[PDB]
């Protein structure tokens, strides 16, 4: 899981 | 150290005053940019399945909270390290000085930092952080978890940050300033004093976020 992408 | 208990108390007072059910809400009057945080979490990657959770602080420093309950922090100079064991014990090292026991942990941290630079937006990129107060210490991530709605990050300086997934809004709570900064759907940011939100009130949207923060803070407390 991830924080908001470029 | 009382930080979480203090925060719970500040949130209970404000939420008990029912800040969205006022005749005239004047949220803007509670604004105090002097209480902008020094630090907040700018990016993160959850690889808890076998490495840990990696993150970036707004000053470009990076840290990881590994699965073995340890942490490792790289300062924005790119070399100065801080390692913190399970029981809070803190050693200060460099990537140049090469203690073999941490090379794997340092390798992982560098992969996280590369990953975050290449792939992820900087939250609060349009915020000038407040200048730190004299021998200003870099915090590390004490605890974190995520629900279905949000991720909750408790830093060692007492501040807790809640990032909501649906709409990308974000709260940063500081029990020392007794303040909350709210980052909007449109990435607009305001810092408010909790005592002034009591006095002037705030919109429903922030009111609900602050009620959610109290329950999140109780949860963080129950782990203790």
Curated annotation (Swiss-Prot), chain B:
Q: What is this protein called?
A: Serine/threonine-protein kinase PLK1
GO terms for MF: anaphase-promoting complex binding; ATP binding; identical protein binding; magnesium ion binding; microtubule binding; protein kinase activity; protein kinase binding; protein serine kinase activity
Q: In which tissues is it expressed?
A: Placenta and colon.
Gene for this protein? PLK1
Q: Which GO terms describe its cellular component?
A: centriolar satellite; centriole; centrosome; chromatin; cytoplasm; cytosol; kinetochore; microtubule cytoskeleton
Entry keyword annotation includes Ubl conjugation:
yes
Originating species: Homo sapiens (Human)
- Domain remarks in the Swiss-Prot or TrEMBL record: The POLO box domains act as phosphopeptide-binding module that recognizes and binds serine-[phosphothreonine/phosphoserine]-(proline/X) motifs. PLK1 recognizes and binds docking proteins that are already phosphorylated on these motifs, and then phosphorylates them. PLK1 can also create its own docking sites by mediating phosphorylation of serine-[phosphothreonine/phosphoserine]-(proline/X) motifs subsequently recognized by the POLO box domains.
Which family is this protein grouped under? Belongs to the protein kinase superfamily. Ser/Thr protein kinase family. CDC5/Polo subfamily.
Q: Where in the cell is it found?
A: Nucleus; Chromosome, Centromere, Kinetochore; Cytoplasm, Cytoskeleton, Microtubule organizing center, Centrosome; Cytoplasm, Cytoskeleton, Spindle
Whole protein: which stretch is covered?
371 to 594 of 603
Effect of mutating residue 122 to R: Severe mitotic defects leading to prometaphase delay. Increased localization at kinetochores leading to increased levels of phosphorylated BUBR1
Q: How is it modified after translation?
A: Ubiquitinated by the anaphase promoting complex/cyclosome (APC/C) in anaphase and following DNA damage, leading to its degradation by the proteasome. Ubiquitination is mediated via its interaction with FZR1/CDH1. Ubiquitination and subsequent degradation prevents entry into mitosis and is essential to maintain an efficient G2 DNA damage checkpoint.
């Amino acid at each position: 899981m991830q924080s908001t992408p470029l | 150290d009382c930080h979480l208990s203090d925060m719970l108390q500040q949130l209970h007072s404000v939420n008990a005053s029912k800040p969205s059910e006022r005749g005239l809400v004047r949220q803007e009057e509670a604004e105090d940019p002097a209480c902008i945080p020094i630090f907040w979490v700018s990016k993160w990657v959850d690889y808890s399945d076998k490495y840990g959770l990696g993150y970036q602080l707004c000053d470009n420093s990076v840290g990881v909270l590994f699965n073995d309950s340890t942490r490792l922090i790289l300062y924005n100079d790119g070399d100065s390290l801080q390692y913190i064991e399970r029981d809070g014990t803190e050693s200060y090292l460099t990537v140049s000085s090469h203690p073999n026991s941490l090379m794997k942990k340092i390798t992982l941290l560098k992969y996280f930092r590369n990953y975050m630079s290449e792939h992820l937006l900087k939250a609060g990129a349009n915020i000038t952080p407040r200048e730190g107060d004299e021998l200003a210490r870099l915090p590390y991530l004490r605890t974190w978890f995520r629900t279905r709605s949000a991720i909750i990050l408790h830093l060692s300086n007492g501040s807790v940050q809640i990032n909501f997934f649906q709409d990308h809004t974000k709260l940063i709570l500081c029990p020392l300033m007794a303040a909350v900064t709210y980052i909007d759907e449109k990435r607009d940011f305001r810092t408010y004093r909790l005592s002034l939100l009591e006095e002037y009130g705030c919109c429903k949207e922030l009111a609900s976020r602050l009620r959610y923060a109290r329950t999140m803070v109780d949860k963080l407390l129950s782990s203790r």
